[PDB]
């Protein structure tokens, strides 16, 4: 949708790899406040915005903390910390067409800038005048949005960039978006370090006769001390063993 | 605000660059945005808005069409030029109350110089039986279209009586026709013998006459 | 949004005009509305505009006092009021909405408005032989008011070669126009030509032949 109209959707309760984000080269900015691009599968974040609009090439500078001009004042606003990612690619060949692509227009005229994260998709006639404008359009009466017109051929600058814009809103509340944690194959009857379900250990683990349910994920045995565990990825109990270990 | 436009009356070859400049006497930006609009307006049709803004194109342009500029100065530029864009071209300034337009181009196709084809045309009898004479010089496939045209009675040359006509650019010949027309009453046609015409082209290395005797 | 006014109206100085301009493809109630003039082979004047909802009309100083704006938004048209017609009034009048920033955005057809005192006369049609390669001829319409003439050669047979000039205004306030027509120098004695001159607003239909 166009920038005035940016679409938001709202993303929780999910594995968000990022992996496809690195991976992808037809990607033209990964700008990042307060947050590292490589470590995004490594953090749990609360919730998740995903802003999708499109932009001219040279207004792609606009998108930024502390920023000023017109797609900035009257049509999205970003936070001055904004810890979260703008991503933009160029889109020159899917957003133009032959002649003018007046489908997508951006909010010339209005009262005053926007707050951050403020959506206007209001079409009444601005007044640009002293004399009341009534709803009509004169000569101090202007109609608030104005189309990009993209053409097959245009400048890097007013070509099509399509912008996705993550608000990532850290907070002490349940995580609900964190990245994947990866893995690691097991290893049979051998003294090796172990994180299984983030319980940090070492020992040799050996395949086990003891049985339960989903209603466990690791096991213990009296005075607190973790002897078996079902690992995620086949769901099979093994028996936890301290490393062979005895005066000389 | 007053629109100056320079060249007003330019001819190029198809798919060739063709450039109009418009200046204004005060500045043209406001608002951030540049007020500078831009007309198109062929024969037989009212004019169609082309350009809006600075740069922005308007509804229904091609691409071949580009505005650009900024403050008092700005410029089309029509890269591909195709066979429609023989028309004349405005600008206009939006700031203001006063609207005001551009000079005008009367854009057209170029072409290699053709030579004039001269030809007379004495008046008729039933003419001179109403009273009047009119004596026509007639230039036929000639580009381009500036051109002058003189007559010559007696010997005497003639001023504030002659009337002349210039067509419309040629589709395919692309060559202009002109006819002069001279008006005179029956007594003062039949006091004299020799009508001549007179024509200097740029086709022409020396002016074409054409001359009768009425008889 | 298409927008159409009268045709060609005939005045005499000192008279009163009353013009008409519909709008249809858009509202007509949002949009201010503009008038243009042009003089015959002249630039672009701008007159005045109202906006439809509210009677406020806005003119130049120099079309203040003669010229009055009105619209109708139950039958959506424009009205123009011209009074105390002048020489100087006689020209093509456009019609124009507002958009795109512009004042005059969106140009309608326009009105031909002629003031003067001449009426409509037949036209006088008068051959022009050949003076006695390629040669050529023509024929002259003369002193007939108002334009336009509709003038051809053997009923459209012969169009190579065929220039009909416009018309231009003498002193005596009527018409002045030509037809010429180039053909070989040997077509003169075997073939017959003849111009066709058609004054619709006189209704006068007019066949010369032109003989060397
Ligand atoms: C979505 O678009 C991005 C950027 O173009 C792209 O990285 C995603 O991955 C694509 O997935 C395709 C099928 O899963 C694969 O064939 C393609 O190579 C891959 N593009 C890459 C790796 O650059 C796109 N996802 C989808 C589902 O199309
Ligand atoms: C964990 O995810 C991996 C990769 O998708 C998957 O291999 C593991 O087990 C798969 O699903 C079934 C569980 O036993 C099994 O029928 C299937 O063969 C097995 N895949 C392979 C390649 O052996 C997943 N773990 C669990 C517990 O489902």
Same mark, same amino acid.
């Given at each position: 949708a166009?920038?005035?109209?940016?679409?938001?959707?709202?993303?929780?309760?999910?594995?968000?790899?990022?992996?496809?984000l690195?991976?992808?080269?037809?990607?033209?900015?990964?700008?990042?406040?307060?947050?590292?691009?490589?470590?995004?599968?490594?953090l749990?974040?609360?919730?998740?915005?995903?802003?999708?609009?499109?932009?001219?090439?040279?207004?792609?500078?606009?998108?930024?903390?502390?920023?000023?001009?017109?797609?900035?004042?009257?049509?999205?606003?970003?936070?001055?910390?904004?810890?979260?990612?703008?991503?933009?690619?160029?889109?020159?060949?899917?957003?133009?067409?032959?002649?003018?692509?007046?489908?997508?227009?951006?909010?010339?005229?209005?009262?005053?800038?926007?707050?951050?994260?403020?959506?206007?998709?209001?079409?009444?006639?601005?007044?640009?005048?002293?004399?009341?404008?009534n709803?009509?359009?004169?000569?101090?009466?202007?109609?608030?949005?104005?189309?990009?017109?993209?053409?097959?051929?245009?400048?890097?600058?007013?070509?099509?960039?399509?912008?996705?814009?993550?608000?990532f809103?850290?907070?002490?509340?349940?995580?609900?978006?964190?990245?994947?944690?990866?893995?690691?194959?097991?290893?049979?009857?051998?003294?090796?370090?172990?994180?299984?379900?983030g319980?940090?250990?070492?020992?040799?683990?050996?395949?086990?006769?003891?049985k339960?349910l989903?209603?466990?994920?690791?096991?213990?045995?009296?005075?607190?001390?973790?002897?078996?565990?079902?690992?995620?990825?086949?769901?099979?109990?093994?028996?936890?063993?301290?490393?062979?270990?005895?005066?000389? | 605000?007053?629109?100056?436009?320079?060249?007003?009356?330019?001819?190029?070859?198809?798919?060739?660059?063709?450039?109009?400049?418009?200046?204004?006497?005060?500045?043209?930006?406001?608002?951030?945005?540049?007020?500078?609009?831009?007309?198109?307006?062929?024969?037989?049709?009212?004019?169609?808005?082309?350009?809006?803004?600075?740069?922005?194109?308007?509804?229904?342009?091609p691409?071949?069409?580009?505005?650009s500029?900024?403050?008092?100065?700005?410029?089309?530029?029509?890269?591909?030029?195709?066979?429609?864009d023989?028309?004349?071209?405005?600008?206009?300034?939006?700031?203001?109350?006063?609207?005001?337009?551009?000079?005008?181009?009367?854009?057209?196709? #170029?072409?290699? $110089?053709? +030579?004039?084809? *001269?030809?007379?045309?004495?008046? @008729?009898?039933?003419?001179? !039986? =109403?009273?009047?004479?009119?004596?026509?010089?007639?230039?036929?496939?000639?580009?381009?279209?500036?051109?002058?045209?003189?007559?010559?009675?007696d010997?005497?040359?003639?001023?504030?009586?002659?009337?002349?006509?210039?067509?419309?650019?040629?589709?395919?010949?692309?060559?202009?026709?002109?006819?002069?027309?001279?008006?005179?009453?029956?007594?003062?046609?039949? #006091?004299?013998? $020799?009508? +001549?015409?007179? *024509?200097?082209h740029?086709?022409? @290395?020396?002016?074409?006459? !054409? =001359?009768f005797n009425?008889? | 949004?298409?927008?159409?006014?009268?045709?060609?109206?005939?005045?005499?100085?000192?008279?009163?005009?009353?013009?008409?301009?519909?709008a249809?493809?858009?509202?007509?109630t949002?949009?201010?509305?503009?008038?243009?003039?042009?003089?015959?082979?002249?630039?672009?004047?701008?007159?005045?505009?109202?906006?439809?909802?509210?009677?406020?009309?806005?003119?130049?100083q120099?079309?203040?006092d003669?010229?009055?704006?009105?619209?109708?938004?139950?039958?959506?048209?424009?009205?123009?009021?011209?009074?105390?017609?002048?020489?100087?009034?006689?020209?093509?009048?456009?019609c124009?909405?507002?958009?795109?920033?512009?004042?005059?955005?969106?140009?309608?057809?326009?009105?031909?408005?002629?003031?003067?005192?001449?009426?409509?006369?037949?036209?006088?049609?008068?051959?022009?032989?050949?003076?006695?390669?390629?040669?050529?001829?023509?024929?002259?319409?003369?002193?007939?008011?108002?334009?336009?003439?509709?003038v051809?050669?053997?009923?459209?047979?012969?169009?190579?070669?065929?220039?009909?000039?416009?018309?231009?205004?003498?002193?005596?306030?009527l018409?002045?126009?030509?037809?010429v027509?180039?053909?070989?120098?040997?077509?003169?004695?075997?073939?017959?030509?003849?111009?066709?001159?058609?004054?619709?607003?006189?209704?006068?239909?007019?066949?010369?032949?032109?003989?060397?």
């Amino acid at each position: 949708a166009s920038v005035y109209a940016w679409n938001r959707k709202r993303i929780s309760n999910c594995v968000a790899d990022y992996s496809v984000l690195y991976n992808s080269a037809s990607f033209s900015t990964f700008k990042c406040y307060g947050v590292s691009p490589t470590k995004l599968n490594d953090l749990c974040f609360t919730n998740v915005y995903a802003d999708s609009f499109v932009i001219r090439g040279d207004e792609v500078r606009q998108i930024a903390p502390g920023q000023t001009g017109k797609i900035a004042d009257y049509n999205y606003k970003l936070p001055d910390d904004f810890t979260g990612c703008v991503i933009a690619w160029n889109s020159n060949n899917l957003d133009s067409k032959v002649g003018g692509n007046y489908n997508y227009l951006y909010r010339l005229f209005r009262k005053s800038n926007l707050k951050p994260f403020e959506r206007d998709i209001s079409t009444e006639i601005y007044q640009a005048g002293s004399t009341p404008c009534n709803g009509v359009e004169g000569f101090n009466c202007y109609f608030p949005l104005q189309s990009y017109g993209f053409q097959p051929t245009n400048g890097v600058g007013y070509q099509p960039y399509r912008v996705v814009v993550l608000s990532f809103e850290l907070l002490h509340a349940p995580a609900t978006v964190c990245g994947p944690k990866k893995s690691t194959n097991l290893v049979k009857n051998k003294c090796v370090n172990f994180n299984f379900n983030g319980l940090t250990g070492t020992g040799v683990l050996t395949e086990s006769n003891k049985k339960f349910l989903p209603f466990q994920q690791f096991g213990r045995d009296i005075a607190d001390t973790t002897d078996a565990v079902r690992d995620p990825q086949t769901l099979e109990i093994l028996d936890i063993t301290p490393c062979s270990f005895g005066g000389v | 605000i007053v629109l100056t436009q320079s060249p007003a009356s330019l001819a190029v070859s198809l798919g060739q660059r063709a450039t109009i400049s418009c200046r204004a006497s005060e500045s043209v930006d406001n608002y951030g945005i540049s007020f500078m609009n831009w007309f198109q307006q062929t024969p037989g049709q009212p004019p169609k808005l082309l350009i809006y803004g600075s740069s922005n194109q308007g509804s229904g342009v091609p691409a071949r069409f580009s505005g650009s500029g900024s403050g008092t100065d700005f410029s089309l530029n029509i890269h591909p030029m195709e066979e429609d864009d023989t028309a004349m071209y405005f600008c206009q300034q939006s700031k203001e109350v006063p609207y005001t337009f551009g000079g005008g181009t009367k854009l057209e196709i #170029k072409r290699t $110089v053709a +030579a004039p084809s *001269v030809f007379i045309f004495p008046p @008729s009898d039933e003419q001179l !039986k =109403s009273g009047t004479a009119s004596v026509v010089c007639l230039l036929n496939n000639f580009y381009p279209r500036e051109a002058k045209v003189q007559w010559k009675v007696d010997n005497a040359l003639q001023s504030g009586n002659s009337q002349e006509s210039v067509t419309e650019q040629d589709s395919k010949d692309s060559t202009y026709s002109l006819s002069s027309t001279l008006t005179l009453s029956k007594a003062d046609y039949e #006091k004299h013998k $020799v009508y +001549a015409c007179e *024509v200097t082209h740029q086709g022409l @290395s020396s002016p074409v006459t !054409k =001359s009768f005797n009425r008889g | 949004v298409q927008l159409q006014q009268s045709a060609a109206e005939l005045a005499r100085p000192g008279a009163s005009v009353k013009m008409s301009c519909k709008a249809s493809g858009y509202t007509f109630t949002s949009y201010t509305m503009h008038w243009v003039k042009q003089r015959p082979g002249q630039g672009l004047e701008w007159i005045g505009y109202i906006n439809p909802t509210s009677g406020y009309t806005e003119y130049n100083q120099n079309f203040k006092d003669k010229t009055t704006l009105t619209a109708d938004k139950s039958s959506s048209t424009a009205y123009m009021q011209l009074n105390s017609l002048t020489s100087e009034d006689s020209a093509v009048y456009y019609c124009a909405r507002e958009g795109h920033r512009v004042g005059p955005a969106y140009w309608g057809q326009g009105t031909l408005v002629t003031v003067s005192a001449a009426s409509t006369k037949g036209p006088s049609v008068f051959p022009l032989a050949p003076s006695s390669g390629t040669a050529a001829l023509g024929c002259l319409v003369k002193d007939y008011f108002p334009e336009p003439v509709t003038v051809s050669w053997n009923s459209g047979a012969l169009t190579s070669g065929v220039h009909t000039f416009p018309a231009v205004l003498q002193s005596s306030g009527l018409y002045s126009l030509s037809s010429v027509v180039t053909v070989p120098s040997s077509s003169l004695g075997t073939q017959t030509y003849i111009c066709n001159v058609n004054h619709k607003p006189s209704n006068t239909k007019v066949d010369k032949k032109v003989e060397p």
